[PDB]
Every structure is written in structure tokens, then in C-alpha cells.
From Swiss-Prot, chains A, B:
The keyword Transmembrane helix does not apply. This is Thymidylate kinase. GO terms for cellular component: cytoplasm; cytosol; mitochondrion; nucleus. It comes from Homo sapiens. Homodimer. ATP binds at R13, A14, G15, K16, S17, T18, R94, K179, R189. GO terms for biological process: cellular response to growth factor stimulus; dTDP biosynthetic process; dTTP biosynthetic process; dUDP biosynthetic process; thymidine biosynthetic process. Keywords: Acetylation, ATP-binding, Disease variant, Intellectual disability, Kinase, Neurodegeneration, Nucleotide biosynthesis, Nucleotide-binding, Transferase. Residues 130-154 are annotated as: LID. Its cofactor is Mg(2+). GO terms for molecular function: ATP binding; dTMP kinase activity; nucleoside diphosphate kinase activity. Its EC number is 2.7.4.9. Catalyzes the phosphorylation of thymidine monophosphate (dTMP) to thymidine diphosphate (dTDP), the immediate precursor for the DNA building block dTTP, with ATP as the preferred phosphoryl donor in the presence of Mg(2+).
Length: 209, 209
């Protein structure tokens, strides 16, 4: 019985990391085998290049950094496929959607071009979008100093997420991320249990393919 | 008057590196501003990952290594564009074609998927293909121990090069690489002088785009 591939997506400060951590804790406590992953995975050689770019410690040509982001997912594919086939549900904080939305916020990068490198990745059984007004997210403290952490860029990424959400090939679910941490968590947990139960019924597919 | 972007392509031991070096020497001696580039460029952080992969000192997931190869070209684009606009002709040993042909020799990698990351690179004004029978190339000493340096893989790459050569969007020119070093060089030099003279007449375009 394979595990489910669950992705959380959303703009800066939407609550993705908090909710991913909580979701894995809850599934494990409910007797599910669940593990947490995140992208970018900053521990590999590629992830270190990405981390330095994000921390503004290095500048990286925009097409190159986009391909590094995708390569950072592809290096985890053999692990992702093996875990799911063993019955483990994987909760992923950001995936190929953040990859397209953020590079897509830069001038002159088509959505078609940004998707391609990620064409063929494991397709998620469930993609939660943690929806909240950029104004409310801005209240969640201040912006970090990482690249992309400013209002104008986030607004452009958000518009790109909105385009991606027209692909009905994916099981997208809107989550009202403006609620409390517990309330948001319960919404996400219920949706996740439903997805786990159906994932055991259909083979893992390929994204954008 | 911009410089020309000239690429040499071909299978293992076709003579690309020898002919690229000689071609730059000859153009410079003929009063042209010409410089030599190569891919992969193993000096950058990405290039070091590629070099270690090629030397079999590390294994890299096949989609990831493909995206690294393309990212390795994109990081040199700002330099490539600046040099050409200044009047410098760039002689490149391998480019996006080797990127598609070699990953395309692996099972289950479509040519369409391998091209995408490289869509939008500076399009070469001239792509020389150093044609020679794998049997004759095999006489040029023995295979190195780098990845891909075996008969079966080279035969598959060669077939992929043949597919790419059906894209009439590019100025492909076949070179009989089986001749002597000097004879091959003269063929390549003449073709290059012609390309330099016309490149000053049309803007640099975008590959596969
Ligand atoms: N439901 C919530 N209500 C209020 N504050 C929240 C809520 N969820 C998260 N926050 C807080 O706001 C900050 C952002 O939360 P977090 O889950 O880390 O965001 P994120 O979406 O992963 N951000 P990023 O990684 O920068 O895109 C943290 O300090 C959280 O405690
Ligand atoms: N025209 C030629 N006739 C005979 N031997 C040649 C010729 N050109 C190159 N070689 C020799 O064969 C070897 C391969 O040449 P080289 O130009 O380095 O190949 P290459 O195509 O760049 N190979 P690779 O980088 O491995 O794909 C070298 O030792 C060259 O001296
Ligand atoms: C996964 C991924 C994230 N990003 C961004 C979103 C964030 O700004 C940044 C760090 O992510 P975080 O907010 O989850 O820590 O990287 C891309 O630009 N491309 C990608 O492929
Ligand atoms: C430029 C490039 C080369 N290659 C290969 C061709 C050679 O096997 C190898 C090293 O190149 P070389 O023969 O020019 O030294 O890298 C790819 O697999 N992808 C690419 O994008
Ligand atoms: Mg986070
Ligand atoms: Mg060579
Ligand atoms: Mg296409």
C-alpha cells in the first residue's frame, strides 16, 4: 500500500513549515508512517549553493539558479519513490510549484519555461495551498533578509501560483491559512487523512507529464 | 560589429578540442579578436560537481546531472553575450547539443525533455559537426576512463546528434573529421571566416526558441 505524497505551498510566512511539522507529528501519532521533507534541501552540495544564494552571500545567474532548484528535487527522487513504495507518506514543505512561482516572478521568465525541468517528478497526491493576504502575512513579524523577502516580489510570485492553480491535473486544495495554528492544522490534517486513504488506490504519477 | 558564436560538436575523440584550439590561434593570427570556451566549464562550483561526476568520483542522479550541465552554460551567458557584443568571436568546444545527445543516450530521456533547460541560450551562428566513424575514433588511442567513454554509449549519443541535426533552425556544417589535423583545421577555418563575416549582419538569436 503506497504512502501519499503531500505538498504544502504558499507565499512567504503562509505557515508552511509550521503546518508541515505539525502534520507529520499528527499522522505519526495516528499510527501512520509519515516523514517530513522540504525544498530546497540545503544539505546537499546543490542545496549549499542555493542556501548561499538565498542568504545573499553569492549571486547566481537566474536561469542557473532555477535549474539548481529543480536539480535539488531530482536528487531526492530515488529516495522519494522508495519511501512511498514502502508505505511512507511524505509531507513536503514546498516543491516544484514554488520553483515555478518564484522564478516566474522575475521579468521575462515564461511559466512554460520554468515548468520544464520539473516535468516528470513524482506528482503529489495532494497540494495544499496556504492562502492568506500578503497584508496579513506581513503582520507575522518582519521580512527575513533572504532573497525574495520583499512585498513586490511576493505579490508577483502569488500571481504565478494563481496561474498554476488552473492546472486541474493536480489535486489542489485551498486552506484558509489566516486562522490560528491549531485550526489551520485540523483542516490540513483531515484533508491529509483523506488523501492517504485514496493514494493506496492509484499508482504514483508524473508531474506536468 | 558583433563577434560570431561558433560551436564544435561531435562524439568522443572526434577532434573537437584540438580543432577549437587551432581555430582560435588561426583567427587571432588573421587579426580577428577570438577567444576559446568549452563545456563543461569545470572551474565553477557547478563545473566541479560535473568534473567529479565525469571522473566517476561521485554518482549524480541523471536528471540532476543534466540540469547541472545546462546550468553550467547559463552561468556563462552574461559573459558570452558581453564578449560577442564587444566584437569577440567565441569558439566553443561542446555546447547544448552535447548536453542533449549524451543525456539522450540514457534510457527513457526524451529529446524534447533534454532540450528544454537549454531553450533560450545564445544561438550559435555556426555549429560544426566533426563527423567520423566510431571505428576510426576508436583508433585514436584508447578510451579514457571517464563516464560515457565506451562504445555502446557513444553510439547512442551519435544517433541523438543525428536527430538534432534535423533542426534546420541551426547553421549546421558537416566536417570530415577523419582527415589529418591540418586538413580538418583548414576546412573549419574557412567555414569560420565566412560565419564571422555574416554574423556582423544579424542579431544574436535564442536557441530552440
Ligand atoms: N496560523 C498562524 N497564525 C499566526 N502566526 C503564524 C501562524 N502560522 C505560522 N505563524 C508564525 O509566523 C511565522 C511564519 O510561519 P512559518 O510556518 O514558518 O512560515 P513559512 O510559511 O514556512 N515561511 P517561509 O519559509 O519564509 O516561506 C512563524 O513565526 C510562525 O510561528
Ligand atoms: N585529425 C586527427 N587525426 C588523428 N588523430 C587526431 C586528430 N585530431 C585529434 N586526434 C588525436 O586524438 C585524440 C583526440 O583528439 P581531441 O581533439 O582531443 O578529441 P576530442 O574530440 O576533443 N575528445 P573528447 O574531449 O574526449 O570528446 C588526441 O590525442 C588528438 O591528438
Ligand atoms: C523550492 C523552491 C523555493 N524557492 C524559494 C522560496 C523561498 O523564497 C526560498 C526559501 O524557502 P522557504 O521560505 O521555504 O525557507 O526559496 C525558489 O525560488 N525555488 C524553489 O524551487
Ligand atoms: C557539455 C556537455 C558534455 N557532456 C559530456 C560529453 C563528454 O562525455 C563529457 C566531457 O567532455 P569532453 O569530451 O569535451 O571532455 O561531458 C554531457 O554529458 N553533457 C553536456 O552538457
Ligand atoms: Mg518555511
Ligand atoms: Mg575534448
Ligand atoms: Mg514543450
Amino acid at each position: 500500500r503506497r504512502g501519499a505524497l503531500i505538498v504544502l505551498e504558499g507565499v512567504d510566512r503562509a505557515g508552511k513549515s509550521t503546518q508541515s511539522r505539525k502534520l507529520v507529528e499528527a499522522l505519526c501519532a495516528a499510527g501512520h508512517r509519515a516523514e517530513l521533507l522540504r525544498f530546497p534541501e540545503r544539505s546537499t552540495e546543490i542545496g549549499k549553493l542555493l542556501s548561499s544564494y538565498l542568504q545573499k552571500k553569492s549571486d547566481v545567474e537566474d536561469h542557473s539558479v532555477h535549474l539548481l532548484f529543480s536539480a535539488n528535487r531530482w536528487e531526492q527522487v530515488p529516495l522519494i519513490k522508495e519511501k512511498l513504495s514502502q508505505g511512507v507518506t511524505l509531507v513536503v514543505d514546498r516543491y516544484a510549484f514554488s520553483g515555478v512561482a518564484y522564478t516566474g516572478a522575475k521579468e521575462n521568465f515564461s511559466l512554460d519555461w520554468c515548468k520544464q525541468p520539473d516535468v516528470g517528478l513524482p506528482k503529489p497526491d495532494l497540494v495544499l495551498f496556504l492562502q492568506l493576504q500578503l497584508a496579513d502575512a506581513a503582520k507575522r513579524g518582519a521580512f527575513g533578509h533572504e532573497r525574495y523577502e520583499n512585498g513586490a516580489f511576493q505579490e508577483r510570485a502569488l500571481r504565478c501560483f494563481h496561474q498554476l492553480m488552473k492546472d486541474t491535473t493536480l489535486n489542489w486544495k485551498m486552506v484558509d491559512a489566516s486562522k490560528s495554528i491549531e485550526a489551520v492544522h485540523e483542516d490540513i490534517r483531515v484533508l491529509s487523512e483523506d488523501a492517504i486513504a485514496t493514494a493506496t488506490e492509484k499508482p504514483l504519477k508524473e508531474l506536468w507529464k
